[PDB]
Design an enzyme around this catalytic site. Structure first.
Site, PDB file in Angstrom:
ATOM      1  N   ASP A 311       0.848  -1.179   0.000  1.00 39.36           N
ATOM      2  CA  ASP A 311       0.000   0.000   0.000  1.00 39.36           C
ATOM      3  C   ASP A 311       0.897   1.248   0.000  1.00 39.36           C
ATOM      4  O   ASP A 311       2.121   1.173   0.168  1.00 39.36           O
ATOM      5  CB  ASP A 311      -0.958  -0.036   1.199  1.00 39.36           C
ATOM      6  N   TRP A 312       0.275   2.407  -0.186  1.00 41.89           N
ATOM      7  CA  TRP A 312       0.987   3.589  -0.647  1.00 41.89           C
ATOM      8  C   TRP A 312       1.818   4.227   0.465  1.00 41.89           C
ATOM      9  O   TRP A 312       1.309   4.512   1.551  1.00 41.89           O
ATOM     10  CB  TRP A 312      -0.016   4.599  -1.219  1.00 41.89           C
TER      11      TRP A 312
END
Length: 601
Positions: A311-312
């Site tokens: 995830d970011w």
């Protein structure tokens, strides 16, 4: 750069040799193997990063920092050898396809012209462009129709591929077992079996049974299940890092995604707290840093060899605006970027989401911390998807076709019908023998007092009332309530905390109902405590992100509301706090139980 080889082959010349190396040969399956052998270290590192990219306003490559992106496109594509980007604001289909073609041409300038994989987050929900407009995923769950999910996936696949979007940062197959979670709307409910069935239809609809030139490669998320957020607070925030399992299911849709060959997988930010799996204590760290979850479970136990992208922004802090966006380095906050990145590699992931710090990775290899052999393992997976998508052979798209496919009238009608038919009716009190819903399309010309909805949406069918006193009925759209927060970045963009309506808002609606029949439609991004409304609404319904017009289509029975609740509506916040965040719809005496929905006539 399409050339004719001495042996007769037509091939894309990607390194410019004038010759057709095997990886440039479309006949071959093994062209990853050949290309791994030719790539520089900096090219291999560039492959393991995916970040945001912005479409220039008129279809040009953005060469300046944007609203979200921070480097120029030539910088990231050429200077950093990066070729995985998550695209953001798209204005028109023509714009997107022209920019996509420009981006892919630029990518040819690299030593081996690796094509760009453009992904996107969900972008079809009316409640957030040129794409067909749909309810949120929870609305599809309310229809509980496997065919509607096939239809959405194929529709979105056609629209994505038309503009050169070939990767999906979805399906999101988290289970909405915790009602306070502010990401419920993008799930497909909380039934693990049902969601697993939708997952097969979703991945088949987007990817096919084999990835090909018309496929979208899916990044299934958020592994191993993002729904059970402690106290409902989400792991985007440093106070919401934890996931808890007090009821000891969430994995089950992801097993289906593996059986179905999802091209990629995204672990969540979440940090499991107090979790024991088969007598073995699980490290309390963000899943992206968690070797037990990524390597032990996903790689070894489940046999998953597709791409794993974090995830970011797990590695570096940011400074968008003038205060600090923290790296989501949950449980490893005291590690530096180098140590974070190393821990993610060691955990078994292949790609850093929301990062472009290729020099940090080259550092680790030169420092001796990470082997080029280890890098080759991930480069192999990333390259495979590009080859299987057909991107090495033809990454270009038709601008004119794109204008006609995206937002095509038939896809717009599918999505509009989904918006209207997913509307779920909860109460429908009886006026004088006639139920409140459907509202009269014929009958009298009605004066309608509207709130939360545009009065223009009445045009043709009814006259706007100045207020409740001169109205035949009132239509009030409301969002599900939440605790308004703005202490940290993004907090203003999430709906978190209590599900209870403010008491003065409840009283104002009651004042409306004292003067005219009141129809309340709640946008159920989370299961609002409907209870105080139940004694005075003439009708009570929920939508999952529907336009005013689609809501009106449902309320008049023009398109019958067929929705049934895919999550229960708890009776009180007391019942919420007493329930287990990982167990589906386990509050006691919910004011509207799971599967509740009324037909109207």
């Amino acid at each position: 750069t399409l050339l004719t080889a001495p042996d007769g082959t037509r091939f894309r010349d990607l390194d410019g040799d004038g010759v057709m190396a095997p990886y440039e040969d479309p006949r071959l399956s093994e062209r990853t193997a050949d290309l791994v052998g030719r790539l520089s270290l900096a090219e291999k590192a560039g492959l393991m990063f995916q970040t945001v990219i912005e479409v220039g306003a008129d279809g040009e490559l953005k060469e300046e920092p944007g609203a979200i992106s921070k480097s120029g496109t030539t910088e990231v594509v050429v200077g950093k050898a990066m070729n995985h980007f998550n695209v953001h604001e798209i204005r028109t289909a023509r714009q997107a396809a022209r920019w996509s073609n420009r981006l892919q041409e630029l990518a040819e300038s690299t030593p081996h012209g690796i094509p760009v994989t453009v992904s996107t987050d969900p972008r079809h929900a009316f409640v957030e462009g040129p794409f067909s407009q749909w309810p949120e995923a929870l609305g599809l769950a309310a229809l509980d129709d496997v065919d509607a999910i096939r239809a959405f996936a194929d529709a979105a696949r056609q629209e994505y591929v038309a503009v050169g979007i070939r990767a999906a940062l979805h399906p999101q197959i988290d289970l909405a077992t915790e009602p306070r979670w502010g990401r419920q709307a993008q799930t497909l409910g909380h039934d693990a079996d049902r969601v697993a069935e939708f997952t097969a239809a979703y991945l088949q609809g987007f990817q096919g049974d084999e990835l090909g030139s018309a496929s979208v490669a899916c990044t299934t998320k958020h592994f191993p299940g993002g729904g059970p957020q402690k106290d409902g607070e989400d792991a985007h925030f440093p106070y919401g890092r934890e996931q808890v399992y007090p009821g000891g299911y969430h994995l089950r849709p992801f097993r289906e995604a593996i059986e179905r060959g999802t091209a990629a997988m995204m672990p969540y930010y979440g940090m499991p707290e107090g979790l024991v799996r088969d007598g073995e204590a699980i490290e309390p760290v963000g899943f992206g840093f968690n070797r037990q979850v990524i390597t032990g479970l996903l790689r070894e136990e489940l046999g998953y060899d597709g791409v794993v992208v974090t995830d970011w922004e797990l590695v570096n802090d940011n400074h968008v605006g003038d205060q600090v966006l923290p790296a989501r380095a949950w449980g490893v906050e005291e590690l530096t970027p180098h140590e974070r990145m190393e821990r993610i590699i060691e955990a078994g992931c292949d790609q850093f989401g929301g990062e472009e710090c290729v020099d940090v990775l080259l550092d680790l290899v030169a420092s001796g911390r990470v082997s080029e052999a280890r890098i080759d393992e991930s480069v192999r997976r990333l390259l495979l998807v590009k080859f299987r998508l057909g991107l090495f052979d033809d990454p270009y798209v038709d601008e004119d076709a794109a204008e006609r496919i995206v937002g095509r009238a038939d896809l717009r009608e599918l999505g509009f019908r989904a918006q209207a038919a997913s509307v779920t009716v909860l109460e429908n009190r009886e006026r004088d023998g006639r139920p409140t819903l459907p509202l009269p399309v014929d009958g009298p010309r009605l004066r309608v007092h509207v709130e939360g909805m545009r009065p223009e949406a009445l045009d043709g069918w009814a006259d706007p009332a100045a207020g409740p006193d001169d109205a035949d009925l009132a239509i009030v759209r409301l969002g599900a309530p939440f605790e308004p927060r703005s202490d940290l970045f993004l907090e203003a963009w999430f709906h978190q905390g209590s599900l209870e309506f403010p008491p003065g808002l409840v009283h104002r609606l009651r004042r409306i109902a004292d003067r005219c029949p009141l129809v309340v439609v709640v946008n159920l991004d989370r299961p609002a405590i409907m209870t105080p409304l139940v004694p005075f609404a003439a009708a009570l319904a929920v939508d999952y992100g529907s336009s005013d017009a689609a809501v009106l289509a449902a309320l008049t029975g023009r398109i019958a509301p067929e929705g049934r609740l895919p999550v229960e509506i708890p009776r009180s916040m007391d019942a919420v706090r007493a329930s287990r965040t990982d167990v589906p719809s386990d509050t006691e005496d919910p004011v509207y139980p799971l599967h509740h929905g009324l037909r109207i006539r």
